[model samples]
Target: NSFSGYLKLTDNVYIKNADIVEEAKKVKPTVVVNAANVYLKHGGGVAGALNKATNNAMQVESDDYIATNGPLKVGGSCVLSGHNLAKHCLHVVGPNVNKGEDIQLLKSAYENFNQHEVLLAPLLSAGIFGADPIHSLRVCVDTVRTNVYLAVFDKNLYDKLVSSFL
Candidate 1:
């Protein structure tokens, strides 16, 4: 079973401790948020998993989007059909703090999802991008405006989020 709970901040937001790709398959949300790079490439990590789940359709969409609109900057986002996991996918580019990227960019990324519904997001910038887990969690909690499921894979990080809300 997944370790899940609702944050006291608002009933609209909930935390689930599980792999985001696996959780998205089980939850089948209307929109699943992808933690993507600026170029929107699904080479590894969350982006890679979601791309694979969609049979590379997501990557094809991203390629088209990039070709037409140019690369998405940090904090920017775009939506594409969630070929298999959900009806839609919101790709948000989070900050890569290890490269001295501003933490605020991560918050901006979360902010861009405010207008969407049933969003399932992983801990932005806290994985390969290397942002602090607690900081990433705080940014997500502060910026999300609609119903969201924060799917976290790390047990320690998930526990930290739970403890913060407690």
Candidate 2:
């Protein structure tokens, strides 16, 4: 892909939750990415992946992936470097993105994402190193309310392979 010399969307955009959601809806999957609701898990909150598989990923008209249309904690870092647990999980970067939770988003959306059975994302988004998805099908300890599904740019997966700043 990149070997072509220039880069593709993957080089310019990372994760586009909204797109993931719409795509998921089309395929009849479970979880979908919420571009608008990407929140941070500060400490004790109710953050988790947008469960599209069950068609219940809280609707909204804003960018508050965790609480679209509402106000979520607008801060960064306390534990896990840039970690925050507002909803089921908090992978939001920061007001400045570079410092926000985009990295965690990639890790979760890609590495931890599941196309098969229930799976869990890597723990401690902040300190969780290797900066890549290790295996597939690992269930999240925080097991969300409903099963989550995934939508991919490709027929197989639309995850980390999408590396730009989506």
Candidate 3:
């Protein structure tokens, strides 16, 4: 995969897997977070006993309980889990191409958020790839967005997200 662009988050924080671990550690995070893990991704949390305890605790808490675990061991490709168990997935997808591929990805993001009326998007691929724009607008036309923010590494795709079909 190739990153054609990066989205801008609040205060313009750009996030990606390429340098996440080191960056995360650098932040001296009080609490680390992760999402829908496959069998291979959850590494820091020991399996068997540890896994069971974590899951049981989540079940006891309200639905908002996020399983506490250490860093996940990425098995193969390092894409964020597509699982949408949280308030939002904040999904980020990277695709590389010299043409207008980034535009398509932005459209897809816009559409998903619009459909859900307030989707948390990911800052990644710098706007390169993931999801489809046209498809997003198709559903977007029928939905409403509480707010829409674009992760803009550059103004190209960001501008498109604002002006694309909807």
In candidate 3, what are the lDDT values of residues 1-166, reduced to their tens digit? Answer: 1222334332322222223223223332222222222332233322122224344433233122334433222111122222222222322222222343443433343333333333323332232223344333333333324343222223454455545531
What are the models' TM-scores?
A: 0.91, 0.26, 0.26
lDDT, candidate 1, 18-97, per-residue tens: 88888778767788899999888899998999999888999999999999999999998988887778888999899998
| Superposed model 3: Cα runs more than 4 Å off | 1-86, 90-95, 98-102, 127-145, 149-166
Badly placed stretches (over 4 Å) of model 1 are 1-9
Question: Candidate 2 lDDT, tens digit per residue, 102-152?
Answer: 443443443233332321122222122222321221212122223333223
**Distance (Å) between predicted and true CA of 24, model 1?**
1.6
Ranking by TM-score: 1, 3, 2
- Which residue runs does candidate 2 get wrong by more than 4 Å? 1-22, 25-32, 35-60, 63-70, 74-131, 134-142, 154-166
- Per-candidate clashes, comma-separated: 0, 50, 11
Q: State the weakest 10-residue window (summed lDDT) of model 3.
A: 74-83
In TM-score terms, candidate 2 sits at 0.26
Alpha-carbon local distance difference test for all models: 0.83, 0.28, 0.30
Candidate 1 is scored at a TM of 0.91
Best by lDDT: 1
